[PDB]
RNA sequence: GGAUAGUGGCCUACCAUGGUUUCAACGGGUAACGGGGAAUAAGGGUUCGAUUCCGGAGAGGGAGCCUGAGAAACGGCUACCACAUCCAAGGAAGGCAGCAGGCGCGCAAAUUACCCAAUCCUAAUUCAGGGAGGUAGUGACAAUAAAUAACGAUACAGGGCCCAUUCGGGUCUUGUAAUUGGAAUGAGUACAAUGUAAAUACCUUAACGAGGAACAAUUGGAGGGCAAGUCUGGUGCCAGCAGCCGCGGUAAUUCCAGCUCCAAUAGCGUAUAUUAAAGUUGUUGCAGUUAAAAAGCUCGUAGUUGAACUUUGGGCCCGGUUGGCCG
RNA sequence: GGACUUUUACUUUGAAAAAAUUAGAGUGUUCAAAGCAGGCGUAUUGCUCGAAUAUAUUAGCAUGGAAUAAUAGAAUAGGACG
């Protein structure tokens, strides 16, 4: 079998210059969850939409439906 | 947008479909050789059709000119590493009288038979395809390997399967397993 | 030519014909195994000559 | 002689008066003219699809005598009409009016095959399957 | 002069009357984006190029314009036209020739998946983002490599360097089988680890997996062209076949079948287009008395073509290329 | 010593010429289509060959040639050299 490798000095190095998929391979960084790809973007569409601070508009819907 | 994946057909199809001479003859090389189907006479036929017709561009040229020289030593060169062309037929006068089985000579199929290791062309192909047999450290499974001069004589059963140490095959493994089993208890 | 002629009658020897189911034979070898087949008997064992080396002459003949 | 110009700078004389006669040559006039756009009953492709409009019995030219069994197909894609032969035997049966058969042409570049006076296209599938599919009965004809 | 970033009839004022054209202008057609390039392979040529690169154009049709270095932008605006969505009928809102997907069209073309790990791009910028791109899915478009079996034993024929008076069989050896014998292998399947962004598959590899009705190769043909049947049964100018020539009306070498056989073979057939074959477009290279084809005749402008002749012959110099002789 | 084609056509050499593709050199992707990779050595801190070359000339540019084929010139001398 031939494959590559690295030897890093000081493994704080190898920390830091590593892709992080190899950390997690060697537990040396934890597995980031995530929402997936079209989750996300769809919430970045739907924060498109709002100008401002969210929770002021939530003021306004709030304000209404009292009725 | 991807760079283009360039590629190539090996082989060539016979102008007159139906001649009986021609037909005799094909099947004549497919039993000597241990062939498959017309198509690996016909790659072959293409080959031989592509290094002729160098060779003619070549001596078309006048002699000493570069690029007849270049061409043309590279081109025997190669000719005589694989053992199709002679020791000396070395001039490209002669690679123009060279014929099919002088390729079809060189396969890996028919070096397995021709030392030893086969006792038939079709013993010889069930062999290389089925993993026992290697050039140097390397199987090679393919029938048209084509051997080189100077590797002809690595050629000799594999590291692993039965006819090179290392275990019986896992049908004779299961004739020792039945043996046992019943009889012996 | 006249176009309206019968067509009463289409299919009538394909119908009409006995059927008769393939007698059950060995299969014959596929790939080079077939090849080599051909070769051995097309010309080895040489068992079928008038002088014109016949390959699928009639009964008898 | 020769009856052609040999002048050096005669080309333009020798290009023309065979761009002239090139249109004596069938197969260059036709596609020049774009035959195959107009003229003909397929758009030039391949194939054509259309729908059964009534089954025709065609005799034969001499010195042939039968009952060439074919079929009229209003094509899908001009609405143009045009006869078509079925293939094997009693294949006929197998294609029913209004039924939607795909056409392919008789091989001759577009003249009339054998003893089919004017028949210049054949059945390939009935209701999107095949002849020989019915016909050897590897598959049945959809049902309706 | 005005305008433009700037040249310029780009536009305006005035003034001239020019500008293109049988060496084909102008117009009409293109099932026309151009090019790198593609198929065909004596050569000359013929045909094709929507489509991986470069250049152009457009973003339903037109025009307008805002911002900005850069747009006459469309995942920017304005308006008309054509479409077209929501509504409480007051109103609002849209441009998939981006990626997937739907409808329609048709002979004709795949998943509403995964990811920034690679390639590179952008930004205030190592980090964010990227349906650019890449991953997997579908995919007999093409292309490469090439399993479907290999080797022995018995029993007749066999040819049989023999040994022969009379199977007196020497010792082999080819094919054959209701006969046996073990060997082998991946197609699959599957721990693992490998691969990977994560997976999939490939490569590697434990435990498995080959004896016929399996792990069963197919597609076309068997009168000529053209490779292979005067075999059997059916049909009876009917059914059908047949690119072409032909075949079938009671002994069908051509149909429907069985058997056998040929050809190619994970591929083979059919239609269409195109090339070779075509010296049947002919420059190379055709033909024109009768086969297709010399204008009834002469004149003649474009075009094409156009006799000969003007420094030959002689004498020196310098240094290169290949050549047989020796290691 | 540096500079004439009267004015051309023609022909030689060269420059300027994208990659892909085509031809082709090198390279055992196990063969192959491909790809532009790789090849040694102790594999302990290394060494190293590559990634050629050929190719439209229609037109332009630079150039050597003057056969062929055109073309210009003194005739009412309004000709040449000084
Ligand atoms: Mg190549
Ligand atoms: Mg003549
Ligand atoms: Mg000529
Ligand atoms: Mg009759
Ligand atoms: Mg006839
Ligand atoms: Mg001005
Ligand atoms: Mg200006
Ligand atoms: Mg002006
Ligand atoms: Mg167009
Ligand atoms: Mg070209
Ligand atoms: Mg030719
Ligand atoms: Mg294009
Ligand atoms: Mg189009
Ligand atoms: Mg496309
Ligand atoms: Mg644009
Ligand atoms: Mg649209
Ligand atoms: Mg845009
Ligand atoms: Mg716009
Ligand atoms: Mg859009
Ligand atoms: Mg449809
Ligand atoms: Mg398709
Ligand atoms: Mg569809
Ligand atoms: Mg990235
Ligand atoms: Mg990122
Ligand atoms: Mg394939
Ligand atoms: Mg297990
Ligand atoms: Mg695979
Ligand atoms: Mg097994
Ligand atoms: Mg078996
Ligand atoms: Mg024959
Ligand atoms: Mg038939
Ligand atoms: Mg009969
Ligand atoms: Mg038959
Ligand atoms: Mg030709
Ligand atoms: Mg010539
Ligand atoms: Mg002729
Ligand atoms: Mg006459
Ligand atoms: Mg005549
Ligand atoms: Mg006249
Ligand atoms: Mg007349
Ligand atoms: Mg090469
Ligand atoms: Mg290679
Ligand atoms: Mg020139
Ligand atoms: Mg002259």
Not at chain 2, 123 to 136: D, E, F, M
Not at chain 4, 41 to 55: D, Q
Not at chain 4, 104 to 123: E, L, N, Q, T
């Amino acid at each position: 079998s031939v494959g590559f490798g690295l030897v890093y000095n000081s493994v704080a190095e190898a920390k830091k210059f590593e892709p992080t998929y190899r950390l997690v391979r060697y537990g040396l960084a934890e597995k980031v969850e995530k929402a997936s790809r079209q989750q996300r973007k769809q919430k970045k569409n739907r924060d498109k939409k709002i100008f401002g601070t969210g929770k002021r508009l939530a003021k306004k819907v709030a304000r209404r439906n009292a009725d | 947008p991807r760079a283009p994946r360039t590629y190539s057909k090996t082989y060539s199809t016979p102008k007159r479909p139906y001649e009986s001479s021609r037909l005799d003859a094909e099947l004549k090389l497919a039993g000597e050789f241990g062939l498959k189907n017309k198509k690996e006479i016909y790659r072959i036929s293409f080959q031989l059709s592509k290094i002729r017709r160098a060779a003619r561009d070549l001596l078309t040229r006048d002699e000493k000119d570069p690029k007849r020289l270049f061409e043309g030593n590279a081109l025997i060169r190669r000719l005589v590493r694989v053992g199709v062309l002679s020791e000396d037929k070395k001039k490209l006068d002669y690679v123009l009288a060279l014929k099919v089985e002088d390729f079809l000579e060189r396969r890996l199929q028919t070096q397995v038979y021709k030392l030893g290791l086969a006792k038939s062309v079709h013993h010889a192909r069930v062999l290389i395809t089925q993993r026992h047999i290697a050039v140097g450290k390397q199987i090679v499974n393919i029938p048209s390997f084509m051997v080189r001069l100077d590797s002809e004589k690595h050629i000799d059963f594999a590291p692993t399967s039965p006819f090179g140490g290392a275990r019986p095959g896992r049908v004779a493994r299961r004739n020792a397993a039945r043996k046992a089993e019943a009889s012996g208890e | 030519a006249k176009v309206h002629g019968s067509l009463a009658r289409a299919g009538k020897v394909k119908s009409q014909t006995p059927k008769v189911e393939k007698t059950e034979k060995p299969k014959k070898p596929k790939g080079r195994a077939y090849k080599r087949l051909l070769y051995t008997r097309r010309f080895v064992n040489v068992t079928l000559v008038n002088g014109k080396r016949r390959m699928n002459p009639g009964p008898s003949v | 002689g020769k009856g052609k110009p040999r002048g050096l700078n005669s080309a333009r004389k020798l290009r023309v008066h065979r761009r002239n006669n090139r249109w004596a040559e069938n197969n260059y006039k036709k596609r020049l003219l774009g035959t195959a756009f107009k003229s003909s009953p397929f758009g030039g492709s391949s194939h054509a699809k259309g729908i059964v409009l009534e089954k025709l019995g065609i005799e034969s030219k001499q010195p042939n005598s039968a009952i060439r069994k074919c079929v009229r197909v209003q094509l899908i894609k001009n609405g143009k009409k045009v006869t078509a032969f079925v293939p094997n035997d009693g294949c006929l049966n197998f294609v029913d009016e209004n039924d939607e058969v795909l056409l392919a042409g008789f091989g001759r570049k577009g003249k009339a095959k054998g003893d089919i006076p004017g028949v210049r296209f054949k059945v390939v599938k009935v209701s999107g399957v095949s002849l020989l599919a019915l016909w050897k009965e590897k598959k049945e004809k959809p049902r309706s």
